[PDB]
Amino acid sequence: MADQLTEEQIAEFKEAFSLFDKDGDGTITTKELGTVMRSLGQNPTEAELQDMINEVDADGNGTIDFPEFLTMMARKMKDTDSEEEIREAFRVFDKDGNGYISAAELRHVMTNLGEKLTDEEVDEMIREADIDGDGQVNYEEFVQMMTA
Amino acid sequence: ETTALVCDNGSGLVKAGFAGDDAPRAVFPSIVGRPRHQGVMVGMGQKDSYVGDEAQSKRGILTLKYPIEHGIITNWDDMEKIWHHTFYNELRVAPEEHPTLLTEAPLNPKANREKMTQIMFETFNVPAMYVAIQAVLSLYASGRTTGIVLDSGDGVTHNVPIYEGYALPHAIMRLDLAGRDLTDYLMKILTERGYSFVTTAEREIVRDIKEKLCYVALDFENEMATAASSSSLEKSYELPDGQVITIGNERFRCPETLFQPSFIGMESAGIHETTYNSIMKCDIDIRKDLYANNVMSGGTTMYPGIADRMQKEITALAPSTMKIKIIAPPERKYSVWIGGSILASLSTFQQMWITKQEYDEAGPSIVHRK
Amino acid sequence: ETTALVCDNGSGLVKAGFAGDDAPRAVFPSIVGRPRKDSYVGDEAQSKRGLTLKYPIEHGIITNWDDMEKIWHHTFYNELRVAPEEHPTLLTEAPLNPKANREKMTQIMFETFNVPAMYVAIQAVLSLYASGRTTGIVLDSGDGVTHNVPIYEGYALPHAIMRLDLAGRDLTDYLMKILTERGYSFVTTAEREIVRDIKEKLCYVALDFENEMATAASSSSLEKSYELPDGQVITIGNERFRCPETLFQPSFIGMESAGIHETTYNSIMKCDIDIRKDLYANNVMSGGTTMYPGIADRMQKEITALAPSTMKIKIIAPPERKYSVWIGGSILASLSTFQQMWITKQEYDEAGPSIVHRKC
Amino acid sequence: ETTALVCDNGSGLVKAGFAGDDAPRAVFPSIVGRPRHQGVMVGMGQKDSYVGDEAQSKRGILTLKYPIEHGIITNWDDMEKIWHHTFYNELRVAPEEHPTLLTEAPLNPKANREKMTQIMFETFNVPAMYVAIQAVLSLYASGRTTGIVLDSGDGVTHNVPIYEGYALPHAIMRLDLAGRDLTDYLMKILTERGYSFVTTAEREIVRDIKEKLCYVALDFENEMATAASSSSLEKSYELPDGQVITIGNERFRCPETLFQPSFIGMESAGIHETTYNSIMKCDIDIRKDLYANNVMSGGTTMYPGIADRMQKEITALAPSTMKIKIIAPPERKYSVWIGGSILASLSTFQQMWITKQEYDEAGPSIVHRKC
Amino acid sequence: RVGVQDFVLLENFTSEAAFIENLRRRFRENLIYTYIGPVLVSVNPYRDLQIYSRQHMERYRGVSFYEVPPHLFAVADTVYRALRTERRDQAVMISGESGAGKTEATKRLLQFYAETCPAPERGGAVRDRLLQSNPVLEAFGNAKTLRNDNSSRFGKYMDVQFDFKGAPVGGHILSYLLEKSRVVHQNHGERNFHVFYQLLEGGEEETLRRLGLERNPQSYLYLVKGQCAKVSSINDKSDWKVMRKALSVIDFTEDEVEDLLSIVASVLHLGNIHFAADEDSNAQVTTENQLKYLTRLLGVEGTTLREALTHRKIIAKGEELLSPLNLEQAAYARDALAKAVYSRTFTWLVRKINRSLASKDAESPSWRSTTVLGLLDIYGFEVFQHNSFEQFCINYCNEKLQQLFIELTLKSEQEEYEAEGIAWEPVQYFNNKIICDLVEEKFKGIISILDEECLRPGEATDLTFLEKLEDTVKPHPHFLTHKLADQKTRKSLDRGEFRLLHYAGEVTYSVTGFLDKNNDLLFRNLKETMCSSMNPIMAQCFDKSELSDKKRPETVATQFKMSLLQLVEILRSKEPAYIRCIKPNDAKQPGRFDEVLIRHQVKYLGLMENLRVRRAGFAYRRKYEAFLQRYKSLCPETWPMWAGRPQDGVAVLVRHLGYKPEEYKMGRTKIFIRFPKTLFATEDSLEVRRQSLATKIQAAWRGFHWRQKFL
Numbered sequence A: 001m002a003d004q005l006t007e008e009q010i011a012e013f014k015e016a017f018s019l020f021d022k023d024g025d026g027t028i029t030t031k032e033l034g035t036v037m038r039s040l041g042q043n044p045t046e047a048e049l050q051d052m053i054n055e056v057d058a059d060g061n062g063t064i065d066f067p068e069f070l071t072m073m074a075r076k077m078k079d080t081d082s083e084e085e086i087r088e089a090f091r092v093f094d095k096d097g098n099g100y101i102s103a104a105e106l107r108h109v110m111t112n113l114g115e116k117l118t119d120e121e122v123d124e125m126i127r128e129a130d131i132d133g134d135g136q137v138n139y140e141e142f143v144q145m146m147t148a
Numbered sequence B: 001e002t003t004a005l006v007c008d009n010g011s012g013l014v015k016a017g018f019a020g021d022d023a024p025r026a027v028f029p030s031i032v033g034r035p036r037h038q039g040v041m042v043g044m045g046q047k048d049s050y051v052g053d054e055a056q057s058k059r060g061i062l063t064l065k066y067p068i069e070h071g072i073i074t075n076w077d078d079m080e081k082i083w084h085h086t087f088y089n090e091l092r093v094a095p096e097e098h099p100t101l102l103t104e105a106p107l108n109p110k111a112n113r114e115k116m117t118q119i120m121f122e123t124f125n126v127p128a129m130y131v132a133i134q135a136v137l138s139l140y141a142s143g144r145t146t147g148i149v150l151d152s153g154d155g156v157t158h159n160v161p162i163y164e165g166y167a168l169p170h171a172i173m174r175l176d177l178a179g180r181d182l183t184d185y186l187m188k189i190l191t192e193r194g195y196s197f198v199t200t201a202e203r204e205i206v207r208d209i210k211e212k213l214c215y216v217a218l219d220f221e222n223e224m225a226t227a228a229s230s231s232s233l234e235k236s237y238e239l240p241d242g243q244v245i246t247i248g249n250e251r252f253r254c255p256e257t258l259f260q261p262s263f264i265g266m267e268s269a270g271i272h273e274t275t276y277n278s279i280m281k282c283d284i285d286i287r288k289d290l291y292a293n294n295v296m297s298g299g300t301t302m303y304p305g306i307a308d309r310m311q312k313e314i315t316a317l318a319p320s321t322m323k324i325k326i327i328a329p330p331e332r333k334y335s336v337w338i339g340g341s342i343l344a345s346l347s348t349f350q351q352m353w354i355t356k357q358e359y360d361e362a363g364p365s366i367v368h369r370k
Numbered sequence C: 001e002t003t004a005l006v007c008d009n010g011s012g013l014v015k016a017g018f019a020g021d022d023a024p025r026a027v028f029p030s031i032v033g034r035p036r037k038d039s040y041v042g043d044e045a046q047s048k049r050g051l052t053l054k055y056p057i058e059h060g061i062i063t064n065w066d067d068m069e070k071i072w073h074h075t076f077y078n079e080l081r082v083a084p085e086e087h088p089t090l091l092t093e094a095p096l097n098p099k100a101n102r103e104k105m106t107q108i109m110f111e112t113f114n115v116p117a118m119y120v121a122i123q124a125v126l127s128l129y130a131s132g133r134t135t136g137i138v139l140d141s142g143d144g145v146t147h148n149v150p151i152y153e154g155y156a157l158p159h160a161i162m163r164l165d166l167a168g169r170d171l172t173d174y175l176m177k178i179l180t181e182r183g184y185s186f187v188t189t190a191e192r193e194i195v196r197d198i199k200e201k202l203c204y205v206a207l208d209f210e211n212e213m214a215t216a217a218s219s220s221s222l223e224k225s226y227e228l229p230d231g232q233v234i235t236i237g238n239e240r241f242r243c244p245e246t247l248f249q250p251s252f253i254g255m256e257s258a259g260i261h262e263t264t265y266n267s268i269m270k271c272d273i274d275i276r277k278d279l280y281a282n283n284v285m286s287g288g289t290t291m292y293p294g295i296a297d298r299m300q301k302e303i304t305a306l307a308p309s310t311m312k313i314k315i316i317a318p319p320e321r322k323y324s325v326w327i328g329g330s331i332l333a334s335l336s337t338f339q340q341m342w343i344t345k346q347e348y349d350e351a352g353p354s355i356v357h358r359k360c
Numbered sequence D: 001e002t003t004a005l006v007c008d009n010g011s012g013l014v015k016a017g018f019a020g021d022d023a024p025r026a027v028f029p030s031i032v033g034r035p036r037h038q039g040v041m042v043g044m045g046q047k048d049s050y051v052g053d054e055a056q057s058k059r060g061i062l063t064l065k066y067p068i069e070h071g072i073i074t075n076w077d078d079m080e081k082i083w084h085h086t087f088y089n090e091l092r093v094a095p096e097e098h099p100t101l102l103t104e105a106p107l108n109p110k111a112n113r114e115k116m117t118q119i120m121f122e123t124f125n126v127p128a129m130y131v132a133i134q135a136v137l138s139l140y141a142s143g144r145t146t147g148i149v150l151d152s153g154d155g156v157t158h159n160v161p162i163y164e165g166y167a168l169p170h171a172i173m174r175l176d177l178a179g180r181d182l183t184d185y186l187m188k189i190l191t192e193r194g195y196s197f198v199t200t201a202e203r204e205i206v207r208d209i210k211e212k213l214c215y216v217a218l219d220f221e222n223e224m225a226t227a228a229s230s231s232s233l234e235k236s237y238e239l240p241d242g243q244v245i246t247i248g249n250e251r252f253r254c255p256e257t258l259f260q261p262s263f264i265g266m267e268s269a270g271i272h273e274t275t276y277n278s279i280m281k282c283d284i285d286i287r288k289d290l291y292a293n294n295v296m297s298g299g300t301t302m303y304p305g306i307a308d309r310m311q312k313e314i315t316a317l318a319p320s321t322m323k324i325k326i327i328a329p330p331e332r333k334y335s336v337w338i339g340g341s342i343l344a345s346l347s348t349f350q351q352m353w354i355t356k357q358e359y360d361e362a363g364p365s366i367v368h369r370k371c
Numbered sequence E: 001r002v003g004v005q006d007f008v009l010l011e012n013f014t015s016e017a018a019f020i021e022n023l024r025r026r027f028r029e030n031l032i033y034t035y036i037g038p039v040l041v042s043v044n045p046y047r048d049l050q051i052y053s054r055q056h057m058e059r060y061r062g063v064s065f066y067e068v069p070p071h072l073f074a075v076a077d078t079v080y081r082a083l084r085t086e087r088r089d090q091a092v093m094i095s096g097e098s099g100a101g102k103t104e105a106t107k108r109l110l111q112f113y114a115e116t117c118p119a120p121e122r123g124g125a126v127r128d129r130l131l132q133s134n135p136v137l138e139a140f141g142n143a144k145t146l147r148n149d150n151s152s153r154f155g156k157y158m159d160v161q162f163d164f165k166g167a168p169v170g171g172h173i174l175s176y177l178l179e180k181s182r183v184v185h186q187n188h189g190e191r192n193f194h195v196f197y198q199l200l201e202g203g204e205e206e207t208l209r210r211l212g213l214e215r216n217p218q219s220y221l222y223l224v225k226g227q228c229a230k231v232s233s234i235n236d237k238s239d240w241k242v243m244r245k246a247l248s249v250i251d252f253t254e255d256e257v258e259d260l261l262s263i264v265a266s267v268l269h270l271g272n273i274h275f276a277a278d279e280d281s282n283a284q285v286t287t288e289n290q291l292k293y294l295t296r297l298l299g300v301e302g303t304t305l306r307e308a309l310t311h312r313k314i315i316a317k318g319e320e321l322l323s324p325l326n327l328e329q330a331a332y333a334r335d336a337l338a339k340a341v342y343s344r345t346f347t348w349l350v351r352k353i354n355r356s357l358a359s360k361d362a363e364s365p366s367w368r369s370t371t372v373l374g375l376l377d378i379y380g381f382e383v384f385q386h387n388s389f390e391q392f393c394i395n396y397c398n399e400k401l402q403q404l405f406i407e408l409t410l411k412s413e414q415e416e417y418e419a420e421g422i423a424w425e426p427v428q429y430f431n432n433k434i435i436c437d438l439v440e441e442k443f444k445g446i447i448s449i450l451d452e453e454c455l456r457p458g459e460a461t462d463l464t465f466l467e468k469l470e471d472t473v474k475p476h477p478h479f480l481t482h483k484l485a486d487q488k489t490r491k492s493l494d495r496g497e498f499r500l501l502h503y504a505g506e507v508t509y510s511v512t513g514f515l516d517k518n519n520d521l522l523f524r525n526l527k528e529t530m531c532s533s534m535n536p537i538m539a540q541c542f543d544k545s546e547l548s549d550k551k552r553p554e555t556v557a558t559q560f561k562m563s564l565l566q567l568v569e570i571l572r573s574k575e576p577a578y579i580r581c582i583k584p585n586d587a588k589q590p591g592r593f594d595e596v597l598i599r600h601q602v603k604y605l606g607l608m609e610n611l612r613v614r615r616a617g618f619a620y621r622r623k624y625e626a627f628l629q630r631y632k633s634l635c636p637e638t639w640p641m642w643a644g645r646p647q648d649g650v651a652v653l654v655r656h657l658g659y660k661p662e663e664y665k666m667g668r669t670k671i672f673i674r675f676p677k678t679l680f681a682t683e684d685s686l687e688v689r690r691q692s693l694a695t696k697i698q699a700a701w702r703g704f705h706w707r708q709k710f711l
């Protein structure tokens, strides 16, 4: 689409896909498409994943093949969100503007707002979003961590 | 509260109240007083004029004036102050709520009831008013339809013979000698002993002497001879400054002016001959029932011994077969008001009011037609 | 800051202060001294007096105007520490004074002191404010004037106002005359200020003059001693009540008038018959010559003999008799209805000093 | 010898003489003076008491007492000294030998007429006496039977209307305001220029100022505005020590107390309205002849311009067809005495005296039957 | 949501019934808070609503005024963050009727600051001292009325004081307008300050014996005039134990509390003193049984007190003159001492709490910062069938706090438009200055005429004062009496009364007791007697330096005017905020809604007139940076950052949001929005756009979630 995948990039994406394929069927679960994209460090939304899955789920079988995963990876690579966009997306939720948010106020927005985190995903976030135990995240540094 | 007002604008006292009361609520002197001296104390609320009982309480620093003299309203600006004080301060009512019965002497100037009507309808906005003749009202208070009424106030004495409710208007006698002429004559008299009263405020002290000391001699020449013989008739009165004054034949020389108007230089016959002349102007069939019903009213009839003298004097005039009788109620002083109370309470009277709508159709002259 | 000044220019003492104070701030003699600075005023002259001491006011009239400008300058500048340009000034006067006395007070307040607005009150009227009354007859008696003003419910009676040019200075001259009978001589203007203090400390009014005269003739029991500034001791006897008796028998000055009690009764007898009762129950007293021991008791005994037996006769002699004219001015100049009574300098420009007779 | 005596006991002046005379023989102030200070020259003939022109000339060392105030004899021993001085020193007569006509204001206490009679009979021993009314006498001098008399003396102003020789007793007015009330107001009013007359002898200096410099303003507000605008109305008077004093609007403010008695806190009408109020108490038929015969009498009616003011002020009150006229003769200060001479001389008066015989039949109350 | 949360939204806004219907509609659904633009309207539910717990202070902390339904927390954040960013002082003004919720509102502002601010230990100390002292100030300063049981008869002012770091440094507490006349004279059906009845019912018998007090309140002349010594709704036998704890928790020693109760007891005894005339009509104290106890309890010598109650002292040429009091003046001198002793002791309790709130910092460099978050709990317009001197003064206070509302708010908003260069016509308003001057003007106002009749010579009375109002304020458009009234009006207004057309409508005043209540004849003889006191509290209330004041005693109306001028001055330096508080019943109960009462609340609070003015002006403003950083996420050209001028970024953003030229203005440095509707529509668009921001963060987290724990 916006770029064409190099055979080395196809091979790296296939090697990452091999951890999910494992037994050699060549195919991954429709939601697990997100997990393999995220293993390759992409930031796909569940709505983006559903909008792509709606064009391959047309004959069922609960699963998608390597070439159509590779095609949906090439879809997500068009228009990826910037570090400053994710930083400002946290800054809009900062009540004091000073660069810090509490673990409870993060859990609040992350469970209130659509594409919600599960309690296990918030616990796995707060495990190191609060870096050392004071109950606060520096969201500017945490976005520079999360975008690495 | 559409009860009628009854206001008896006397020469000396205003009596006022509501029809169907037993007695007047307001009884206060018919005076306006104006301060005659320099108001040096800036602090207190000095008034340009005072009315009635406050004028009578402040009287040493005021000049007191009466707007009514001889039953005629001589000062309409002072009279509007009196009516305003009557309604607003003493009775505490709006004249627009209340039809007002006023009173007048017989044989008065016609402008006196026109301007009294114009003020009630154009200044006090009264819903309806009437002007009754005072000595007719005294006959309602006495519980009678037949009798001759002698009313004496502070300004006028008048006789009105009435038979079976018909007043006989040609036999009405009026005499402009009453209580203020007796005060002014007591002021002339009292100088003979040395007491000098000359101010408008001292006239009220000579009035208070007259109201407390004076009486009518059953025979003037014998009381005059009695007072010349010994201090048995002499009485004492204490002035506002605590001086004690002793009064003697002056106690019955003042009331005698009613029986001898020549004491104040008048050509008239007295109240006994004026009563008999009024009876003798009436039809012969009427006289027997007038002789037996001489009703007396107003404060100048309040002297001790006056009904006993009047009976003696009219018996000397009347035929020996008549039963000459004099009706002098204890409430004599309020009978004109108690009559206006009865009259304004009668259901038959409610057609006889002049309404404001009839004063819009014809001017102040409507009052001569009702 | 800009309250009214209230300034009782008494014949003997200036009392001055602000409308709203409960007592005068300045109280000092109406004395200018000159050596015998070019001159001294008030307490400075009264202490330096070894000076020819002169009073510019005699019998309530300003007889010397240049010394009165010095007393007003001392009053405002030295005593009250005040600029007259900022404060309207309530002055006072005796009744029945010359018209030149008001007119020249009015001119000097506006053209020397630049006062914004001024008023001249009659002193016995102000004394009725301090006693809390609007009916009463005031006997006011200062250094120079004794006068009566009868007032009924806030109206004064100018035909029944009485004035007597005998008060505390004439008594001081009379004590200074009697003391020569003992062999004590006082003839200097400074010695006259010694004899004023003798009068203020030793004298009293006898309830019955002939009984006290018999008491001091038959016994030493009434005598008292005074120590002079020189250290000498002066012993006084029947002179303690001979001096104040001159208010009740003014013939000891060689005056012709009736006494202070007769002048008060003669005022009541010029009033209308009705009001006399409320005057007899309200004889107010004020000014320092009403301060003798026994004077309210003598004055009641004497007015009880003149007036009819049924009248309740009362004499209002406050402990602060001596400042009741000033306290009365302090009240008057504080009234909100008084603030339209002032002569303002704009009114003094459109009509000259003679405005004070139309306004006051 | 035994011709009648006439004695107008004024509040201010005794006027006395015989009924034959054209004017009073003795005119002197109605004062008793008593010495005030203590006499020091032994053998100086200083008296216990002084009367009349001796008290008026020794007035520096005396207090002056008037025994008549407002026509009432307030002190009867001082009044006996005045009558004794009148007969024995001034007239040079024995009163026991002359029938004596006395005078009074109309509305007096009866004890004044009684005791004035008791003294004339039991003290002065007079053969016969009478007590005429001052305003009735003033009409005999004025040569008429009809007129309204306004008499103002030193202590009383009174109005007595008489028609065809009949008085109208209800129409008689008395005002206790005349010359001494005008002097006491001038004593108060001179304080405004800073002159302090206060003693009974300084009242005689203010009396002499009033008698020489005062006049009645024809229009008071136009004179007030004139004296406020010029020195033209100011006049000097030299006091008895030689001090010149100057007076201005005090000259016509003093007599204005007659037309405005409210100037002395009196409530009454002025003398002009009191004259009109007396005519209006009379019968309508007599009023025309009263308006044309206002007699003015006694010394307080002497001010320059008082007839012109009085004619203007009654012309403003009466119906404009009336010919209001005022009889102010040159001799009007003595018309009560001149009228008493005519009365005591009339052949038809000689039965009207109260005689000593009639005063022995009935005591002092005999006066009210005769006068 | 239920009814419109901001009255500027409703379209029938000239109509009083549509406003009261929206109150009635929201209230019965437990929505007790509703705005008029920036102003809050708060209705008292008379029950526990759990809307004040810590989770609600979190929910409102730093949230913008339009995201959430109205609450005190939404005003509190707004006035706090104004102080925290403009660094200029603020004043939260609470007013409304007795029983309307002003003192419960004040408690929830202090709990909110304590939980939201950076320093929770010093926030806890300033909260706790301002709350634990409340039962004391209520016992000494509230009283029972014809209406509510616990009316606050003073204005209580309270600060939390902040540095530039945004932490509470300390507090302040002040008390401006204590109703002195009530200490001595209650109207029928009203009772004196609560401490007296709490002392008599609640005290230990040993204490009441020590004080010389019997239990029955009708035995005291200052407690009995109200004719309601016993009340069923008030438990004086139990409020006393919370009151005595509260004194103990302000760190009062038992010595200070016995000094304090000795004054409450002394005020009871001062009322029981009876004078009788000597032969000169001078007052003499007839009894000895009161002066026996007052000698001990006030710590002043008994002959000295007997003299001071019966004589007034002046000082002249250094001499001191005792002048005796007529027994009317001795009654005023006894009562003026009771009002003085009580006022100064309440002022002493307030100052005793205030000195415990003060900064612990050195007040020395680097100290260069003070900012104040002031609160005022002041009464609303007090109106009854019978209004007296008390309501005249209270309603004159609300006349002046409105004159200040015009000056600080309705004028500064016009000067904001002219400073920001917006060409807009000013909103027409009615100006209280004509009515302030009717009450207070130096020699023309009602207070000056009332002070004259207390000072005037002669037999002056309440009715002679009314005759003087009638002649002095004769032509005036906002003053009326039965004499001055036309006949249509004379049926509604009686001979003992006058009427003022206050800014919020007429109130009609009975003159009876105006001269008796305005008199405060505390002569210096009574001051110097008290300066000499052996009671430690009276030695601090009465001070040797005050005896230098040469003036006559000031009247209670002048003392109220002079302390109201201090309340206006202490607010005039600060940027205001407002809460208006509504009592839904004259007799408590939840859910019940009296429309004849609430229509009177809505009238005299002036809520319709504030709405008419506030709807005609602009609803909202922000500096372009503070507008842009919030709303830019709606406009891709400004998201995540705008590179141009802030004003230019807002200029494209308002085109993206599609604002029409009547909805907004571009001022010099502030954007303005006229109608709240535009801003609600924008805030609702932002609230859906936040779903995308969360989705991006959640998708970014899920893109990191795997990579740190595999391969």
Ligand SMILES: Nc1ncnc2c1ncn2[C@@H]1O[C@H](COP(=O)(O)OP(=O)(O)O)[C@@H](O)[C@H]1O
Pocket (backbone or CB within 6 Å): B009, B010, B011, B012, B013, B014, B152, B153, B154, B155, B156, B178, B179, B180, B183, B207, B210, B211, B212, B297, B298, B299, B300, B302, B303, B333
């Ligand atoms: N007890 C009395 N004895 C004699 N005269 C009296 C008495 N009471 C009142 N008067 C006189 O009567 C007059 C008032 O009478 P009143 O009937 O009220 O007259 P009017 O109707 O004209 O006012 C006054 O002159 C008063 O002095």
Ligand SMILES: Nc1ncnc2c1ncn2[C@@H]1O[C@H](COP(=O)(O)OP(=O)(O)O)[C@@H](O)[C@H]1O
Pocket (backbone or CB within 6 Å): C009, C010, C011, C012, C013, C014, C141, C142, C143, C144, C145, C167, C168, C169, C172, C196, C197, C199, C200, C201, C286, C287, C288, C289, C290, C291, C292, C322
């Ligand atoms: N205690 C006193 N006893 C008698 N006379 C006094 C007393 N105090 C003051 N005076 C006298 O009264 C005069 C001062 O009185 P004051 O009222 O001040 O007079 P003024 O108004 O003229 O200044 C002096 O003559 C003084 O000696």
Ligand SMILES: Nc1ncnc2c1ncn2[C@@H]1O[C@H](COP(=O)(O)OP(=O)(O)O)[C@@H](O)[C@H]1O
Pocket (backbone or CB within 6 Å): D009, D010, D011, D012, D013, D014, D152, D153, D154, D155, D156, D178, D179, D180, D207, D210, D211, D212, D297, D298, D299, D300, D302, D303, D333
């Ligand atoms: N020319 C005058 N101008 C003004 N007053 C005068 C004049 N001549 C006399 N008097 C006054 O008239 C009064 C004396 O007049 P008189 O008729 O004799 O009065 P009476 O009879 O009462 O004594 C005194 O008051 C006197 O001062």
Ligand SMILES: [Mg+2]
Pocket (backbone or CB within 6 Å): B009, B010, B011, B134, B152, B153, B154, B298, B336
């Ligand atoms: Mg009558």
Ligand SMILES: [Mg+2]
Pocket (backbone or CB within 6 Å): C009, C010, C011, C123, C141, C142, C143, C287, C325
């Ligand atoms: Mg003096």
Ligand SMILES: [Mg+2]
Pocket (backbone or CB within 6 Å): D029, D031, D203, D204, D207
């Ligand atoms: Mg003489």
Ligand SMILES: [Mg+2]
Pocket (backbone or CB within 6 Å): E102, E103, E151, E152
């Ligand atoms: Mg409260």
